[PDB]
Amino acid sequence: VRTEFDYSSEIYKDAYSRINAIVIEGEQEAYSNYLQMAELLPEDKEELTRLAKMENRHKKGFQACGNNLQVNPDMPYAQEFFAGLHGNFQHAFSEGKVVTCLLIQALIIEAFAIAAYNIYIPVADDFARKITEGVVKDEYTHLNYGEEWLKANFATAKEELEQANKENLPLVWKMLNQVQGDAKVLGMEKEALVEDFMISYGEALSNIGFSTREIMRMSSYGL
C-alpha cells in the first residue's frame, strides 16, 4: 500500500537500479573524501577516519538494499551523476581548499543525503526501511565534524564559503531535476526532497554563522 508501483515490477526495479547506485556511489565518495580531508586536516585524522569508515558501512547497507530487491545497480550512471560535484571537490582538494571541500561534502551532500533518506523511509520496503533508518540514526548520533569545523573557523572561512556555495549549489538543483523521474517511481516527490534539503542546508548555514538574509540568498542560488 506504500507505492503506486509494486516493488517487484520492472518499472520499480529499473528506477531503483539508478537511485540505489546513486546512494552507493555517494557513500563510496564520502568514504574517499573524508580520508582525503584527513590529509588536509591531520590534527583531526582520527575523527575524519571514523566518519569515512562509517560511510563505508552505510554503503554496504545500501548495497544490501539493492540485493534484497533483486536489483543490479547502475554504477556508471551514478558516477556521471556525481561528476560535477566530485570534480569540484577534487579540484578544491588539490588546491588545499579545505573550506570548499567541507562545504561540498559536510554541508551540501550531507543535507542532500539526509533529505533523500528521510523521504525514502516512509515508502521503502520493510528491509530497506530498517537499513535506512539505521543510517539516519547514525548521522544523528555523530557530530557533523565539517559543520563544526566551519563554525569554529567561520570568520576566516566566510568569503570562501559564499564562493563555494555559488559554484556548487546550482549542481544540486541539476541533480534533483535529473533524478526526479526515477525518484517519483520510488514514491519520492521532488517538492519534499527540495524542502528537506533546504531546511537541512539552511539550518547548517545558520549554525555555522550565516544570517537569515544571507541564508535566503545562498540556499536559493541558481534555482
Numbering used by the authors: 6 to 228
Pull verbatim passages from the article behind this deposition.
The di-iron center is contained within an antiparallel four-α-helix bundle, where two histidines and four carboxylates (aspartate or glutamate) supply the protein ligands to the metal ions.
However, there is only one hydrogen bond between Asn123 and Tyr145 in 1593, and the corresponding residues forming the other hydrogen bond in sll0208 and PMT1231 are Gln49 and Phe150 in 1593. Thr159 of PMT1231 and the equivalent one (Thr146) of sll0208 are also involved in the hydrogen-bonding network close to the di-iron center. Since PMT1231 is more active than sll0208 towards n-hexadecanal under our assay conditions (unpublished results), Asp49 and Asn123 of sll0208 were mutated into the corresponding residues of PMT1231 - His and His respectively. cat values of sll0208L148R and sll0208D49H/N123H were increased by 70.5 ± 5.3% and 65.9 ± 4.4% respectively, whereas those of sll0208D49H, sll0208N123H and sll0208T146L were significantly reduced. Firstly, the results of 1593L146T, 1593F150Y, sll0208T146L and sll0208L148R have clearly demonstrated that the side chains of the residues consisting of the oligopeptide (residues 144 to 150 for 1593) whose conformation changed in the absence of the di-iron center had important effects on cADO activity. Unexpectedly, the Y150F substitution of sll0208, in which the hydrogen bond between Tyr150 and Asp49 is removed, had negligible effect on the catalytic activity.
